[PDB]
Design a binder for this molecule. Structure first.
Ligand SMILES: CC(C)=CCn1nc2c(C(F)(F)F)cccc2c1-c1ccc(O)cc1O
Ligand SMILES: CC(C)=CCn1nc2c(C(F)(F)F)cccc2c1-c1ccc(O)cc1O
Lengths: 237, 10, 235, 10
């Protein structure tokens, strides 16, 4: 029996909020990246450090620790880029037209154009960001969504499955709880719930497109990829 | 033997 | 428009009535088939389904209200997702098998690095089965994909995006209406709604993986002119 | 464009 299912809605929220990874910085340098090398250099370095925080974050997601080590590995291998991207989109919410990879690294689509096949992904991220903004997405909602991605994205590529789906149900309850607390009507609740979960389909799309692009520069040998990033990437092929 | 295997333990 | 004014039961009736037919394949049990031959069957079958899908999309409430260029984009983005959820729905009552056609039932044991996609389609089918997905819910999910999958890859065009979101909220209302009529509690309705919509994330994943495999098959050289144009849209 | 054509048929 998992502790996750015995948690109340507010306990679930507080657990996720406190498990939140910090916002990392990129290297301090006013040199705005335009070359493919320098931009991807800054992005890989950042992604690599964020991955270590993500791993220790995932272990603090209720129900994740009850999974076998292998299942934990599979879910992270499947979801990591989605988790990075929705984080990026969340951080960039209050910066319209901008992507806040780090507080000292604000990228616009003009810089995305300066790598081949990147601007389309930039535009999708920017659209998701403005979408988050027009919905007035809250932090409590954000952490629920990120947890959903972690548990859902690799669940159909597998009784620990029923466990994941019970935990998934628990998060749904938590999302509804947050909307009820925010004063939303019953109709507004299931409409907003649906709106949030449909964006996950787009997040999945961006991750898949990104994964293709990362495989290219990996085969290109453009930019130095760490062994950890290489292993996460190989899991998708 | 994956790095992720090790990182999920520490 | 006519879409926004429809009741929930009217929405369901409109969608059920707009359902495309289930086509047959040219599969011959006695004929030997290579990987190229089996693919020929699937490509040919999908190509004929696309024609029905296009006419089906025009009877999805709200879709016709959209500009022609936006109708093209949504179909270009979602066509493989719609085919796949169609396949998964028809395969619901056939565990371990995929019913491409009434005369074409394949298992996992049948080729060219598509087994991974097969197993994902099989898992989704098994998921629908354990959830006991209803036809009224399926047609709603399929219409959601059509309207949602390409809505964020779209300067006066923002009004178009708002209209699509309104219709999407109607379909959500319709889904809830169905689950409430089935006697589900409030908590159960929201949970089931969430479960159904998370499946769309997996359906998007399968489509993207499928589109990758289609690109390589093209460069290997048997695709119709329509399929070729639909494939180029993603690249 | 085939898709563009099949859509506008009536
Ligand atoms: C190898 C790397 C840097 C993976 C992370 N990554 N990849 C990205 C691409 C792609 F190269 F795939 F097209 C586009 C936009 C953001 C991308 C990120 C990324 C996302 C979030 C984040 O906090 C940091 C990142 O580098
Ligand atoms: C070029 C073709 C056959 C596109 C449609 N298509 N592609 C598929 C693949 C892939 F080739 F991508 F791996 C795997 C499984 C089913 C696939 C289908 C398909 C789906 C539903 C349907 O009713 C008919 C199909 O051929």
């Amino acid at each position: 029996n998992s502790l996750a299912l015995s948690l109340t809605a507010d306990q679930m929220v507080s657990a996720l909020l406190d498990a939140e990874p910090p916002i990392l910085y990129s290297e301090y340098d006013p040199t705005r990246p335009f070359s493919e090398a320098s931009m991807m250099g800054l992005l890989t370095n950042l992604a690599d450090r964020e991955l270590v925080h993500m791993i220790n974050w995932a272990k603090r997601v209720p129900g994740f620790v009850d999974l076998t080590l292998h299942d934990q590995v599979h879910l992270l291998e499947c979801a990591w880029l989605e988790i990075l991207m929705i984080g990026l989109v969340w951080r960039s919410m209050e910066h319209p037209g901008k992507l806040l990879f780090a507080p000292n690294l604000l990228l616009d689509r003009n810089q995305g154009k300066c790598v081949e096949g990147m601007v389309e992904i930039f535009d999708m991220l920017l659209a998701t960001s403005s979408r988050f903004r027009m919905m007035n997405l809250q932090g409590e909602e954000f952490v629920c969504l990120k947890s959903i991605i972690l548990l859902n994205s690799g669940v159909y590529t597998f009784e620990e499955k029923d466990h994941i789906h019970r935990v998934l149900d628990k998060i749904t309850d938590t999302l509804i709880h947050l909307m009820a607390k925010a004063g939303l009507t019953l109709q507004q609740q299931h409409q907003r719930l649906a709106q949030l979960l449909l964006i996950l389909s787009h997040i999945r799309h961006m991750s898949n497109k990104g994964m293709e692009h990362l495989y290219s520069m990996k085969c290109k040998n453009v930019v130095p990829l760490s062994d950890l990033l290489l292993e996460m990437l190989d899991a998708h092929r | 033997h994956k790095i992720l295997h090790r990182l999920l333990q520490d």
